[PDB]
Amino acid sequence: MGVTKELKSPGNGVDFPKKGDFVTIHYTGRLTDGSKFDSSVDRNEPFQTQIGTGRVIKGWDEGVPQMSLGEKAVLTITPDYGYGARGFPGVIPGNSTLIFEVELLGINNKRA
Template identity: 55%
Template sequence: MSSGYTKSILVAGVGQKPKKGDSVTVHCTGMGKNRDLNQKFWSTKDPGQEPFTFTIGEGKVIPAWDEGVLTMQKGEKAVITAQPHYAYGARGFPAWGIMPNSVLKFEIELLSFGPSKIKASHILVKHEKSRRLASWKDENGVEIKKRSVADAHAILNGYLNEIKISQDKKATFAAIASKHSDCSSGPRNQGDLGWFGRGDMQKGFEKGAFALQVGEISEVVNSGSGSHIIMRTG
């Protein structure tokens, strides 16, 4: 264990541990406001907050997190106590009431982890609530403006059924994307979006894509652009 932090496990996790470069998502409550380790300065469970996602092992968070969370398993809850040089050091974090050279305590739950970037293809069907009511095959949005969200879902579920019964799902997905997707990636790249990381895509799309394993195809997911089915390819 590093001399910069200690870890005490509250609830054991299961399975493998994250590796450097993975995207990890945690719940966390930080204690140590005004040098009082019983006083909270921040929590992902506070109103308006949500689980925190970061790329581990790349210096994007304090060292106690970068090193400590690498030792955790999925579902594990632990208390990590960070010495000042493994937390915010001499500068502190005044906005949160963290004084210079403060020892801090974090109760962390490792919710999930996986690659920080994935590769995926998609089929997009726009509808009347899409943020841009036009596409490469409907430049004035004549059909899109008449299409409800339910209509878009029905169209995509039809494509999904066709893909599921196909002997070559990847080829069928690509063919449908090329002809029918409202995204220009359809005719240009058979729906292939290439590699992307968290924060690169709209939230609904990102959540659906990162939940998939390589080769898996999603059910219908929604984003500001419209409705999609997604196939993870890398």
């Protein structure tokens, strides 16, 4: 519903993030017209966060734990699981669906 995940290339199928785990991710974010608004790949700097604890938008907290270590997927996130009516200033309009290409590179100390 709020986030849909499309698997593009599989991970190891056995290791999945649990609530409270720290994940390492390479991502590219796009609006629905396909335009890129941000990418950790382009700055050669993976993104790390604790997952499942509200430190990122709800679409990530709910979508990322579905991925197995090493998976590449696309998360499609509705505004209720993203930045809502406000959007994110300078970057994301209000009422925006978001498309993230996500590669799960690490779960705690485990690396893909």
